UniProtKB/Swiss-Prot annotation:
One of its GO terms (biological process) is protein maturation. N-glycosylated. The N-glycan structures are of complex diantennary or triantennary type, which may be further modified with up to 2 sialic acid residues. Residues 1-217 form the Peptidase S1 domain. It comes from the Eukaryota. The active site is at H41, D86, S177. It is linked to Amelogenesis imperfecta, hypomaturation type, 2A1: A defect of enamel formation. The disorder involves both primary and secondary dentitions. The teeth have a shiny agar jelly appearance and the enamel is softer than normal. Brown pigment is present in middle layers of enamel. This is Kallikrein-4. PANTHER family: KALLIKREIN-4, KALLIKREIN-RELATED. Glycans are attached at N139. GO terms for cellular component: extracellular region; extracellular space; secretory granule.
Length: 223
């Protein structure tokens, strides 16, 4: 997360860490007691998913739940065209027990409107190039589809939307993949991609446009 601040502990209860024995390669979002949503480029045959974390050390959180998962359902149009339809549903082995620090969030029905003040969180790269020790939070504003489409042409696809790109240089970055972008108390997008270096002025990050997939998500989860 570029130019953000430590989030208040457990203030983003839907945040999930997709981790390995040594690294953290992506985040995800709890959208149902038994399902975590993430970017399709974060795919793995199996996952160790960390919920209720602030620092990435599970023992530091009495309420943290590290859960296993091996079933992933990627959107069938992922990467067609290049980089589009960047989402995947990970079905946990067992439902998580929702608590004060762990909670699923609903997906936005309304599509992103330019100027909305939203929040993105993650454990990815900071402005100095180092990784944080705890979950980072930053506000970024949604950019119009007209600007997004022209800035990223021909990579822009309706399954994407742009946020950020201001002089404040706030942006998400490597390691924030699959993490949430929250607008109006709803999950509006997933950190998908952008340009390097992160946080260039006039270059907003790109996010998965979830308002375009609620039906597919509902169908996958429920069935
Ligand atoms: N928004 C970005 N600059 C970004 C997001 C994800 C990522 N893997 C790399 C860069
Ligand atoms: Cl705009
Ligand atoms: Na995308
Ligand atoms: Na959306
Ligand atoms: Ni470690
Ligand atoms: Ni805590």
């Amino acid at each position: 997360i570029i130019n953000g601040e430590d989030c208040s502990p457990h203030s983003q209860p839907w945040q999930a860490a997709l981790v390995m024995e040594n690294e953290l390669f992506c985040s995800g979002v709890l959208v149902h007691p038994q399902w975590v949503l993430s970017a399709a480029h974060c795919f793995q045959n199996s996952y160790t998913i960390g919920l209720g974390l602030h620092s990435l050390e599970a023992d530091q959180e009495p309420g943290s739940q590290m859960v296993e998962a091996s079933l992933s359902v990627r959107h069938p149009e992922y990467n067609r065209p290049l980089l589009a339809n960047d989402l995947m549903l990970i079905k946990l082995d067992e439902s998580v027990s929702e608590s004060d620090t762990i909670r699923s969030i609903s997906i936005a029905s309304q599509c992103p409107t330019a100027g909305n003040s939203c929040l993105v969180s993650g454990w990815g790269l900071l402005a100095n190039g180092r990784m944080p020790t705890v979950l980072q939070c930053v506000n970024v504003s949604v950019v119009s589809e007209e600007v997004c489409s022209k800035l990223y042409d021909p990579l822009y696809h309706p399954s994407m939307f742009c946020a950020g790109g201001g002089q404040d240089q706030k942006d998400s970055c490597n390691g924030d993949s699959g993490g949430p972008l929250i607008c109006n108390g709803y999950l509006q997008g997933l950190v998908s991609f952008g340009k390097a270096p992160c946080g260039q002025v006039g270059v907003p990050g790109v996010y998965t446009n979830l308002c375009k997939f609620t039906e597919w998500i509902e169908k996958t989860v429920q069935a």
